[PDB]
């Protein structure tokens, strides 16, 4: 149970972030979600329920990250899920897109953590969950920059675990494999796509399955888990 | 919730195995625990409650493992926690102790899994959790054989995940760091031991904290987690 | 032997880069080294000998990286060693320093690789060696940004290996542990510092020892090695 | 150069072990190779040349390992390459074959190392190279036991590095991917097999390519490399 804990989920208006926020609100946390669009943000907060609230934020804009930290200054659980993921071969990758990818995926999260963790350390407790990707642990053509930004987060998980752990603050990564919102038709039919067919479990994850690993690491159930990567990928890393 | 699921925990009469069994019984599983001593085994089963039952077994004895599989043939959750852990330098290690360590920690678990997983695959669902150790991922003098047996389990986690995953059977490892049953006095005083002082969290784990990671991987909450290692070590692997 | 091969070493005027360039020139490569200072650059090139030449370059400046690629367009061996490494706690880390660290350590190397690898792929052979650090695999307080930039390189090693390997181009990382230029007095005396005392080998590396791993991966001796990390750290990662 | 060093290669009469021994003899080492068959052993020793000598040994027989250590008691380089590799699904795996696999691949090497390393530590220098496999790091159906034995060696690499490193003795693993002795016809034709087609380099390794990594780690060039795994697999681990 997360009663009395405040959980901030960046990029929490859809996908993995939305379902992570939904689970934590249903467990009694006071949830704050962020996203770029105010209308979808308010609808996402109403979808989560339980008093969840929306704060508009652009993680690639440090002025916006500053205002986000100012509006949610005291945070016990922080899920760093906001990010972009455009693909291109190394030979095709443009400079503008490279800079945006690192500014949004790494720079914004870094200084948001720097602010939020200061309060956690002063209070003597907290849990930070970085969302990464299997592309940060294996090589997938087209994902060089995206994978590199999330590999930076994997290392920051370890450094932050060492820097904050003496004050009871845990830091971990959740590394998702292929994930897709299930459609109404997907319990029907027989076709298996090439992506799923490569994984031991022979299917893609629904976002809610990734969110269960986030909830675990965020919660006091994982009280002795820190500095680590939890792979939620149907076996992708193991093969 | 684990209602309607049968969970077998080898070495479930004390420590991590006892607390893993306690959590799963409290979540509605029909729990079977094993151990070498019948008196402590029955007392452990009564301590767990919820209809948990004891089956005497010696994992280093294949006749005993055969009888264990015969007495608990249909198993949805299998926690491979039974094991011995005597320490010695490589130069001091004796042949008898080496053979016992691998026969008990690896051989018994291997063929128990071979039997139990056959039923899981036929039914299309199951979860297997191997208990390993930080000594299988980092080098600790005195733990050469013990660490090697649990490293064998870490690889078997990956091979079994690949072999059983197409039929909905998941396999993962829980790698515990320093763990100690807390005493009544341990919230008092100021002394910090050298073991704890090396970990980011600056403390040792209670067995119940390791068991929470076992419960997570055993349960449908980890439905997309397979082939992986969950480190529960206060940051030991990350530093 | 590297006769007929051109090897570019960024940051090759001191330390690991200088000694990597020295070894490759002594093995017959046409060596190009880069660095920020023209006077030290020319002295370093004369120290290496064997026709090694200097090209001034600032990896944090894309105009300079463009001119570097223009001046050394056809490259068979590329050692990405240029980088900065200022330390600070996450709470003390400034925005300016963060941006400089990623622009220099990641952005410059990324687009230099994008240019150099295009020629390697067209020719059907090449070897790229990224210099990283143990701080990208374990958590060391004060090294959050530095470790994160080199973790990005570790992931790029894997993605580039997948993207370039079909055309015979190999990509690997060398991850150095504690390294220090030996002094004349260091074979004398008895004192052992705390840094060395934590490593299995109980000493720090001379840069020439790191360079031997670079030479191996750069050379045809490592013809089947790609996508991997070679740890040169006295055992630091293993403990 | 390995002049004045004695190198013992178990299973050195064919494949990776033969080519590792050939390289070290050509670099001036006094090479001893082992194998089960005396006739092929003497022909292999004559093929290597340079005074290489054969000692018959069965690593699955501790009496034979004792005699091997007695006949080659003072060893500076030890390459643990002897091993068997029969495949079977976990459901098909027999008890006899399991026991033979661990006795040969793990038990024999363990106590051979225990004897040889004692002399290395007393002398203050030595290098031990364990041959493992990609199947010890990723899950491949049919390789459960084989992969598990070599994963035990990977952990022993780390523990031995910690136990022997203070006395200047290094221990590392070489993890080979798909390897095949090239045939005379293989530079001709166009067909690419499924095994090669999965690797970034799109080919299988010749044993001599694995041996180059063994020579590197065995030699003083790798003077600061210990406790680590060198992957020689065409990119297999990275994808
Ligand atoms: Mg910028
Ligand atoms: Mg036996």
XYZ file of C-alpha atoms in Angstrom, chain B residues 78-225:
148
model
C 8.359 -23.764 -8.001
C 10.881 -21.887 -5.847
C 14.293 -23.610 -5.924
C 15.709 -22.442 -2.593
C 17.223 -25.626 -1.139
C 21.009 -25.515 -1.012
C 24.137 -25.703 1.126
C 26.801 -23.041 1.367
C 30.049 -24.142 3.082
C 32.990 -21.832 2.400
C 36.663 -22.582 1.759
C 39.519 -21.138 -0.241
C 40.194 -22.838 -3.565
C 43.454 -24.178 -2.095
C 41.630 -25.683 0.902
C 38.542 -27.008 -0.910
C 38.097 -30.766 -0.594
C 36.754 -33.115 -3.266
C 33.931 -34.519 -1.114
C 32.576 -31.058 -0.328
C 32.794 -29.944 -3.965
C 30.774 -32.952 -5.130
C 28.147 -32.503 -2.414
C 27.784 -28.811 -3.265
C 27.052 -29.439 -6.946
C 24.909 -32.548 -6.346
C 22.726 -30.681 -3.843
C 22.624 -27.170 -5.319
C 22.560 -28.013 -9.054
C 21.814 -31.689 -9.735
C 18.795 -32.019 -7.446
C 17.210 -28.781 -8.632
C 17.872 -29.632 -12.291
C 15.939 -32.891 -12.295
C 13.226 -31.568 -9.980
C 12.693 -28.801 -12.550
C 12.736 -31.357 -15.370
C 9.817 -33.177 -13.722
C 7.792 -30.189 -12.478
C 8.161 -28.152 -15.685
C 6.796 -31.010 -17.798
C 3.430 -30.565 -16.089
C 3.600 -26.767 -16.334
C 4.265 -26.918 -20.082
C 1.421 -29.398 -20.630
C -0.915 -27.024 -18.762
C 0.374 -23.893 -20.498
C 1.384 -21.855 -17.440
C 3.858 -21.833 -14.574
C 6.574 -19.836 -12.856
C 9.968 -21.074 -11.642
C 12.187 -18.971 -9.362
C 15.813 -19.971 -8.750
C 17.476 -18.553 -5.642
C 21.079 -17.660 -6.426
C 23.543 -15.239 -4.776
C 25.663 -12.130 -5.346
C 28.673 -14.490 -5.123
C 27.635 -15.845 -8.553
C 28.100 -12.401 -10.155
C 31.090 -10.985 -8.235
C 34.171 -12.679 -6.845
C 34.221 -13.226 -3.078
C 37.187 -15.194 -1.655
C 36.054 -18.394 0.029
C 32.887 -18.798 -2.083
C 34.307 -20.371 -5.256
C 32.243 -23.566 -5.272
C 29.089 -22.068 -3.758
C 29.148 -19.177 -6.228
C 29.796 -21.569 -9.118
C 26.764 -23.738 -8.285
C 24.493 -20.705 -8.230
C 26.024 -19.366 -11.449
C 25.007 -22.674 -13.012
C 21.447 -21.927 -11.857
C 21.634 -18.438 -13.406
C 22.445 -19.981 -16.794
C 19.729 -22.618 -16.350
C 17.276 -19.746 -15.751
C 18.072 -18.525 -19.269
C 18.046 -21.916 -20.998
C 14.825 -22.999 -19.274
C 13.215 -19.661 -20.132
C 13.977 -20.369 -23.785
C 12.827 -24.001 -23.611
C 9.600 -23.497 -21.640
C 8.512 -19.985 -22.653
C 6.585 -20.948 -25.782
C 4.198 -22.803 -23.447
C 3.699 -19.886 -21.072
C 6.155 -21.047 -18.392
C 8.383 -18.301 -16.949
C 11.776 -18.828 -15.263
C 13.738 -16.201 -13.315
C 16.456 -15.876 -10.683
C 16.424 -13.935 -7.433
C 19.986 -13.024 -6.460
C 20.143 -12.119 -2.746
C 22.875 -10.072 -1.161
C 23.720 -10.213 2.551
C 20.682 -11.486 4.454
C 20.162 -12.042 8.177
C 17.150 -12.756 10.372
C 16.665 -9.537 12.377
C 17.016 -9.759 16.145
C 14.881 -7.940 18.696
C 17.781 -5.627 19.595
C 18.653 -4.478 16.074
C 16.564 -1.299 16.064
C 18.690 -0.234 19.063
C 22.362 0.693 19.248
C 24.632 2.419 16.753
C 27.218 -0.113 15.519
C 27.350 -0.834 11.778
C 29.183 -3.973 10.679
C 31.679 -4.081 7.822
C 29.361 -6.177 5.637
C 26.486 -3.700 5.775
C 28.834 -0.708 5.532
C 29.893 -1.791 2.036
C 26.358 -1.704 0.604
C 24.591 1.453 -0.643
C 21.682 0.784 1.748
C 24.140 0.273 4.650
C 22.227 -2.677 6.118
C 21.582 -6.373 5.674
C 18.275 -7.694 4.376
C 15.757 -9.532 6.424
C 14.709 -12.776 4.680
C 11.190 -11.381 4.253
C 12.623 -8.698 1.942
C 14.140 -11.339 -0.350
C 10.823 -13.217 -0.236
C 8.951 -10.188 -1.610
C 10.971 -10.456 -4.830
C 10.238 -14.191 -4.990
C 6.501 -13.556 -4.562
C 6.592 -10.943 -7.334
C 8.283 -13.234 -9.885
C 6.175 -16.241 -8.865
C 2.910 -14.292 -9.262
C 0.939 -13.244 -12.369
C 2.117 -9.663 -11.705
C 5.402 -10.645 -13.426
C 3.568 -12.122 -16.438
C 6.086 -10.666 -18.932
C 9.250 -11.302 -16.865
